[PDB]
């Protein structure tokens, strides 16, 4: 006897899902539903086709494969690398994604919110622990969706102006799977009328791409961007960049000139021959530069993210974007010398000068310098604490800091509802050393809800302010607000503008409201810094 | 002699003086005014070192102050104490190479430590003679003996045109030379202990002070010094042989003087004096303020490299060294070159008001210096606020040509051996009659120092009395040991020594010393290493 409850037709055909079990109770869960012909053989590099029809019930009770990816050896059985890995067989046929729906489905239409992960545009799976979408599902009656997308070669690796490796392909599975909900969330009590992109870093910047890319603009109609941007030094490469990659890989994996011989030697590689060189195609020695990534091609981003977060219209948008309190400090033991998460890291000022370079591979020896200059505490230049603390302030203000603030500032000036926020707390159970702080992506346990699970052993406070957090996201899913219709004791948090700049604190204290998201410092970065950079 | 008072009779080198007995409110003093100490560089002699005053016959009257060196005038606001109290009060005259002294009356039984003033006043105006710097008060009170100079200045103390016998430039360095080895000889004939010699100077005076620490012929003249607001360091108080030498050749144009430096320098010698004057703002490459016309050259002579290379590669183990700045260093030049600034008004401006002003405030600023500038003094969060413009401003002047060198000075001289002490003078006389907008404006605590409050008929409240009161007593305990603080008082805060370690400077306010950490440490970072960095590359 089955459970109609589980029992779902899709325009694919039918679906049987499973009854997962939530804190509060009972939740439907649609796993690995496939959203695309599988991208193996000749499909590798190419853009996703939509899955063909099937017979009979698919079964959706279990998560599919993870796409191709390199995975972390950094640190071997640590819990702070490993809940990032894969936790599925990794495959190229892994164009899949993810409904959690409460139980029994929703009665009216409800709002839908739509997981992007992050994970350098080389990494990441939907179906990662931190990216449950259980919790928001059963307390918040909320209809999530993850998907998973090709990343590394396998999702972005381009031949600029080519048919067979056109670039953004990993884009175009998520916006395949955007598609797909439209057409078929209505099926699971989702309303197609209220969707909300949410996603953390590459996929954070990801959400940005689709609001600069108009195709994807009729299939969301509300975003959240976390810890990322389309604009920036590490989300995308020009054509020119793209194509040097390509090439400098076919050559390490002995590949073949023109592009359709080189991408049908590169079709012939098995996937881990293609990731044992990925890392081997940048130009300098870096943190926080990632092989494969979107490229400005002319075609999904019209112009680069800079030129059109400067010239678009986004009167009709309204964004949620924010930062953790230390978004750098993960990215220094992973490739600066002296780090560690073994010790405290204290550092000498070579070491600091030494890390700029890594940290900022772009800049001169004198965009370095005003960078080592403005980063010093002058009342203790020598000091290996404050060295070591600007270090990572460097990594986290040039790559996510500085870039929210300039993106903010645009989506408000040219018509958006923009809401900004600092994520401050750090999880008790945080395995990183205390010197990293809030680290980029250890907001979104919070977010998702998982402190509500007793097993997990959040304190009583993280429980209450997952609650919170939840709360904010699904009230901004719904209203465009994150506002809630009725705390009126907890601070109004205000839309973010560029005459009062206006922030709040997410942290176990009550919204705290802040001005100015590090004003100086991103001056530095965003005005000052280009004009060094374009007269060098 | 014979119905004089025999307290007042004294003899130096060039032979006898007749001085005068001063009433300070504590009781009597000893004046020596107007003593020559070189002969008059006139006619021939203009333009050219100091010659050291040849004797005399008979007693000469040392009873008022001599003729003040030939200068400009500033004419701009008549009847306003701001701008006319540092104005000339005797007749100008280029026959103004004379000095005073003041001391307790009766003299001095024991050898006592000598405080000598150097006045400011950009290098071309300035006169020991003002009434801020009369030092009565110091004689009275602390028992000091304060002698003050009188230099040439503008074209007649500093064109130059190096290389040449007839105008070497630095000659008003030289004038400050000649008097400081005229106290060598004569000071003890005062009750002055010539053992014991400490130069004090505001402003283009402290540049001056500085230039004596840094030149190897004046070394010998003194032991301690005391730079208020200014340093030989830092963008305005040299320029190079090239600068010196195109300023002069323009100004000698302006006044008739054509193409050989020895017609064109025997030309500007049958110029009147004031032909001179009309002509000296004229010849400055660009529209600016904090600039002077003519001012020490680095001429490989009186000072054998520019300062910053002397002040980075000096030996400053054997001095004791007192260094500071006033709250709003640059906010009076605002009002003298700035559109937007006025005395008048709120002086409220624009941000197009303020990167116009950054252009004239720091005349030397390529586009993206100055665009650097901009952007490190902007408030991001009120970026069009007409009162942080202001403010941001006054702070561009003041750290620029002030703070900033000085806070490198403090640094390079701690660094090198030497004994540093360090203040911010942040009160503001209650009977300024500048704008409050402008706050502490450069050379104001000046008259506290000296001790003026301390006449009840000038109208300073008890507290400004008290606080010039312990001011005197930092500056005579600074001579008198190389230590301001008094060693038997040890209740009141103590003044820590400058280091670069700690960077320990305190507040001259009326509340008791408080110690502070980093003399403006990250702005003076921008204006110290990067801003330099800005220009040697591009
Ligand atoms: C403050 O005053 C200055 C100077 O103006 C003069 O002094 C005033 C007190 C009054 O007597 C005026 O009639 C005088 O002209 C003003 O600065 C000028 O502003 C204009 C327009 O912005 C500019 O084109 C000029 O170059 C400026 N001139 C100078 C000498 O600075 C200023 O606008 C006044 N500020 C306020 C807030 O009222
Ligand atoms: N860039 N890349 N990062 C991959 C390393 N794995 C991590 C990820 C995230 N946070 C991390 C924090 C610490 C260590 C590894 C992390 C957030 C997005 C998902 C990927
Ligand atoms: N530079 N120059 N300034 C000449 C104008 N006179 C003034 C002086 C000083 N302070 C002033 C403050 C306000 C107005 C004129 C001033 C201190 C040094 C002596 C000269
Ligand atoms: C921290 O560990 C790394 C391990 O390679 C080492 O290089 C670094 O010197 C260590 N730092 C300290 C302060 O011990
Ligand atoms: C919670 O703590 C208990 C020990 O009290 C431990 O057995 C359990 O495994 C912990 N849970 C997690 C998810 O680490
Ligand atoms: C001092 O105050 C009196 C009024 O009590 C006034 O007439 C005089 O002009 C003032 N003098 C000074 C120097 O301010
Ligand atoms: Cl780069």
Not at 112 to 120: A, E, F, K, Q, R
Request: glycine letters at 8%.
């Amino acid at each position: 006897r089955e459970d109609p409850q589980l029992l779902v037709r899709v325009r694919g055909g039918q679906l049987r899902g499973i009854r997962l079990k939530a804190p509060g109770g009972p939740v439907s869960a649609f796993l690995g539903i496939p959203f695309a012909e599988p991208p193996v053989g000749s499909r590798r590099f190419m853009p996703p086709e939509p899955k063909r029809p099937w017979s009979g019930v698919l079964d959706a009770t279990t998560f599919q494969n993870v796409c191709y990816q390199y995975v972390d050896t950094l640190y071997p059985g640590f819990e702070g690398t490993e809940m990032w890995n894969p936790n599925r067989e990794l495959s190229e046929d892994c164009l899949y994604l993810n409904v959690w729906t409460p139980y029994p489905r929703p009665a009216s239409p409800t709002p839908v919110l739509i997981w992007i992960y992050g994970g350098g545009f080389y990494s990441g799976a939907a179906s990662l622990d931190v990216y449950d979408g259980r919790f928001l599902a059963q307390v918040e009656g909320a209809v999530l969706v993850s998907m998973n997308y090709r990343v590394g070669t396998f999702g972005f690796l381009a031949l600029p102006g080519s048919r067979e490796a056109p670039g953004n392909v990993g884009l175009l599975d998520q916006r395949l799977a955007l598609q797909w909900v439209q057409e078929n969330i209505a099926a699971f009590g989702g309303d197609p009328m209220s969707v909300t992109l949410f996603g953390e870093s590459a996929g954070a910047a990801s959400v940005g791409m689709h609001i600069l890319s108009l195709p994807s603009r009729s299939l969301f109609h509300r975003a959240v961007l976390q810890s990322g941007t389309p604009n920036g030094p590490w989300a995308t490469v020009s054509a020119g960049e793209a194509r040097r990659r390509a090439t400098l890989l076919a050559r390490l994996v002995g590949c073949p000139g023109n592009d359709t011989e080189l991408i049908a030697c590169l079709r012939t590689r098995p996937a881990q021959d293609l990731v044992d060189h990925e890392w081997h195609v940048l130009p300098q020695e870096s943190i926080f530069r990632f092989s494969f990534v979107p490229v400005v091609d002319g075609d999904f981003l019209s112009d680069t993210p800079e030129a059109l977060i400067n010239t678009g219209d986004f009167q009709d948008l309204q964004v949620l974007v924010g930062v953790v309190k230390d978004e750098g400090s993960y990215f220094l033991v992973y490739g600066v010398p002296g780090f560690s998460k073994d010790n405290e890291s204290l550092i000498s000022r070579a070491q600091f000068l030494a890390g700029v370079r890594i940290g900022v591979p772009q800049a001169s020896d004198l965009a370095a310098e005003a960078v080592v200059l403005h980063y010093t505490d002058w009342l203790h230049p020598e000091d290996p604490t404050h060295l070591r603390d600007a270090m990572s302030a460097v990594v986290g203000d040039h790559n996510v800091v500085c870039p929210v603030a300039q993106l903010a500032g645009r989506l408000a000036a040219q018509g958006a509802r923009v809401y900004a926020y600092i994520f401050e707390h750090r999880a008790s159970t945080l395995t990183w050393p205390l010197w990293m702080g809030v680290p980029h992506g250890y907001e979104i346990e919070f977010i998702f809800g998982l402190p509500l699970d007793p097993s997990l052993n959040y304190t009583t406070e993280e429980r209450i302010f997952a609650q919170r957090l939840m709360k904010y996201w699904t009230n901004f899913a719904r209203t465009g607000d994150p506002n809630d219709p009725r705390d009126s004791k907890s601070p109004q948090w205000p839309p973010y503008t560029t005459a009062a700049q206006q922030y709040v604190s997410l942290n176990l204290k009550p919204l705290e409201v802040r001005r100015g998201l590090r004003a100086q410092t991103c001056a530095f970065w965003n005005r000052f810094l280009p004009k060094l950079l374009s007269a060098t």
